[PDB]
């Protein structure tokens, strides 16, 4: 076994209870599948192996997987019908992370989403499907990544605003579609669409939520998100449900669309309980994150949990002034080494694509979000007093900047164990697309008059 | 083709799929749908465009659900038809139970259940075998998030916090697997969750207060708090490295306005270390509730054990806690 791999990633935890239950059976099985891969001795792994004993990111294999994922699927994939906009987003996002220019997809993105847009507003999974905030989020982020005036023009912004206004609920949250469930996905996806399209803050004059005294899309919203924190410190999908990393991401990213992280996050969340629960998502020896207490690691949480960290770290550090002298940072409060080992040693499939965990086939969702998390560990992401937005509402959200956190040498508690050859493009921690793509779409829309 | 040949469907023309292919550049991530699904969905487009509330449309939604239960639009249209036609929702629930038993991790089936069960005209009280059906689901996946979310809604809707099957079903799940955090989370709702029907639902009391006080109960039932803490200790002793009951006990103490130091001796009993949670508990007791005499140093020692031996992947968070305690102690020495 390679000398650059610490014992922490080569052995199960020291403490082991005698009692066996289904939870410990599945945890033990997962550890035992990950150990040969962490050690770099499994025959499915391709090198080169770096000085820390970790295989390279298999860039060419993943590029081919993601390009293939944009083409046609057989009938057996019918359950993905509602998710077609997601499949476009996950593939474009993975290609962008890996350094491709996805400009050449503009026309095919336009073709795809023109058909999925409803004349009453919003985007659904495809022709004849009602609008849904997740498909609208995926489509807007896809349009942002390909760019260009023609793609930006496809969206009916006024009708999107009217439709999103229908989703606003009396309790401050959002349903995901008319007649659908209310949870923090609804809030985060609706507010990202609202922000990137520079929609008016006021609710449409006919929005039902106005009958309950609400006036704007954000009225009652951070209070609703505060009511999704749980006794464990994490954040659930809806009030009283179980704390989960995917819903913590949605809630914290949505709070950071409302003001500066160091104002909004401590006001609406108890950081004293949030921080240890977020820290406790990461396991050894696997190195990755689980979504909830006593469940298993999964490479997609490299994004949902991993990208909570720049948001919480900004809430603790505050806004960085471009002029002022560099301020102190709390730094990274999780193990970048562990996450990087889990993604590169355990989540790469030899034929291309990344996966949840050893033993699972890849898919483009896991490929996108494992790459997104690997990118996060490679950058300092922080918010500043310099925004690309001309307006106040979401000003902090458009102030995020990035510096590389370069590959390290030596042992240490906060180190970069990828190689620079594994470096991916930085993604915005709230919008989950490149910063320039988020900037360009927001600024374009800011400069368009709102439709009559 | 089944719909196009059926005279039941003769009075309506289907709307053909337009996916944008041969209306421009080729679309992305297309699916080569079966002929049956293409035909059914083309009839669904037509009925929904006409806002048709009919028995044939209802049967069509069931057919499409059999092919693709993740089609969110068809479930919402189904519920519209059921209410518009005054269908028997007891019979709808018995059909939905079969769909639920066939398909896991699905937002629509459990959202649809809540849409139906929320109708007080049809379900004025908790149906007599509804809790048993949820236990049929938990026997197959005891941590199914959407079924637990539905059960939290069911408890609030029918005011079941003190219903004995809610606690008994949580206790049966915790007997089978004491590490089932979903069951611990539901236990917290039953015992400590807010119940005021005039407030919006919340996971914790006191969300209008300062965030450090989130969870504090307005009125504390001290004997209930003692009982829940004793229950937690008994479960911890079965498997001391299980995080869930330690986190539940922290939540109970926060709700009750009681300090972590109530469990100082219990935590010390595990420390030769049988529980990393006991070490973290001690770090907090010495850091935050002890204002004495080398208590800061002892907190730092506990955090050092965590960072070096007992939970080393979280080293950067333990070191952040050491920095906070060291700054706090420096501030104390300074005044």
């Amino acid at each position: 076994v390679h000398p650059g791999i610490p014992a922490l990633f080569r052995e199960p935890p020291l403490i082991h209870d005698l009692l066996s239950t289904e939870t410990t059976e599945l945890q033990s099985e997962t550890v035992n599948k990950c150990l040969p891969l962490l050690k770099g001795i499994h025959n499915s792994q391709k090198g080169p192996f770096n000085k820390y004993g970790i295989p390279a990111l298999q860039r060419k294999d993943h590029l081919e997987y993601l390009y293939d994922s944009l083409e046609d699927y057989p009938a057996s994939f019918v359950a993905l019908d509602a998710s077609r906009p997601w499949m476009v987003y996950w593939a474009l996002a993975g290609l962008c992370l890996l350094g491709e220019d996805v400009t050449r997809f503009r026309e095919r993105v336009i073709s795809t989403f023109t058909a999925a847009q409803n004349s009453t507003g919003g985007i659904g999974g495809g022709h004849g499907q009602m609008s849904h905030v997740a498909s609208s989020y995926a489509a807007v982020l896809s349009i942002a990544m390909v760019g260009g005036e023609e793609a930006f023009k496809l969206i009916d912004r006024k009708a999107m605003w009217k439709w999103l206004g229908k989703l606003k609920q009396p309790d401050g949250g959002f349903t995901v579609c008319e007649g659908g469930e209310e949870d923090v996905r609804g809030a985060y996806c609706a507010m990202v669409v609202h922000a990137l399209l520079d929609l008016p803050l006021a609710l449409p004059p006919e929005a039902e939520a106005r009958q309950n005294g609400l006036e704007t899309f954000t009225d009652g919203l951070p209070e609703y998100l505060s009511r999704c924190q749980t006794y464990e410190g994490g954040i659930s999908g809806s009030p009283g449900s179980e704390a989960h990393g995917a819903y913590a991401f949605c809630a914290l990213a949505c709070l950071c669309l409302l003001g500066r992280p160091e104002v909004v996050v401590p006001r609406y969340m108890n950081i004293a309980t949030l921080l240890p629960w977020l820290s406790a998502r990461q396991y050894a020896p696997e190195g990755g994150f689980s979504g909830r207490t006593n469940k298993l690691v999964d490479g997609c949480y490299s994004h949902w949990v991993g990208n909570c960290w720049p948001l919480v770290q900004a809430a603790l550090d505050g806004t960085q002034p471009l002029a002022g002298p560099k301020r102190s940072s709390v730094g990274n409060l999780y193990s970048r080494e562990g996450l990087t080992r889990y993604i590169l040693s355990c989540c790469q499939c030899k034929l291309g694509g990344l996966r949840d965990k050893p033993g699972k086939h890849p898919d483009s969702y896991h490929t996108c979000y494992a790459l997104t998390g690997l990118s996060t560990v490679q950058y300092y992401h922080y918010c500043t007093d310099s925004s690309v937005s001309s307006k106040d509402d979401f000003s902090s959200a458009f102030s995020w900047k990035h510096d590389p956190n370069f590959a390290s040498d030596g042992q240490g508690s906060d180190i970069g164990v990828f190689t620079e050859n594994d470096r991916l493009v930085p993604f915005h921690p709230i919008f989950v697309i490149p910063h320039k793509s988020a900037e360009d779409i927001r600024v374009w829309f800011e400069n368009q008059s709102f439709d009559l | 083709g089944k719909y196009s040949s059926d005279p039941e469907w003769a009075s309506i023309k289907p709307i053909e799929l337009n996916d944008g292919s041969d209306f421009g550049a080729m679309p992305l991530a297309t699916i080569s749908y079966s002929p049956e699904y293409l035909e059914a969905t083309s009839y669904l487009r037509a009925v929904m465009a006409a806002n048709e509330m009919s028995e044939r449309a209802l049967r069509l939604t069931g057919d499409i659900i059999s092919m693709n239960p993740a089609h969110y639009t068809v479930w919402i249209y189904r519920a519209k038809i059921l209410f518009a036609l005054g269908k028997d929702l007891n019979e709808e629930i018995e059909w939905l139970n079969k769909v639920a038993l066939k398909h896991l991790k699905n937002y629509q089936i459990w959202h649809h259940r809540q849409v139906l069960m929320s109708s007080r005209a049809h379900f004025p009280t908790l149906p007599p075998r509804e809790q048993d059906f949820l236990m049929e689901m938990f026997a197959q996946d005891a941590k199914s998030y959407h079924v637990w979310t539905y059960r939290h809604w069911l408890v609030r809707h029918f005011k079941l916090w003190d219903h004995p099957r809610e606690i008994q079903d949580v206790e049966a799940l915790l007997k089978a697997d004491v590490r089932n955090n979903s069951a611990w989370n539901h236990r917290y709702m039953l015992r400590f969750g807010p119940r005021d029907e005039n407030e919006f639902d919340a996971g914790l009391h006191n969300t209008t207060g300062p965030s450090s006080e989130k969870g504090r109960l307005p009125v504390v039932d001290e004997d209930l708090v003692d009982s829940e803490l004793q229950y937690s200790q008994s479960r911890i002793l079965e498997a001391p490295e299980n995080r869930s009951p330690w986190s539940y006990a922290r939540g109970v103490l926060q709700a009750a306005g009681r300090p972590l130091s109530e469990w100082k001796d219990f935590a010390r009993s595990f420390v030769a270390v049988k529980s990393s949670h006991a070490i973290e508990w001690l770090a907090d007791v010495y850091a935050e509730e002890d204002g004495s005499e080398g208590s800061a140093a002892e907190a730092v020692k506990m955090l050092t054990l965590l960072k070096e031996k007992y939970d080393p992947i979280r080293r950067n968070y333990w070191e952040y806690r050491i920095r906070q305690i060291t700054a706090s102690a420096a501030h104390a020495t300074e005044i």
Partner: peptide, 5 residues
């Protein structure tokens, strides 16, 4: 298997 909608 992960599901988001």
């Amino acid at each position: 298997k992960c599901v988001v909608m």
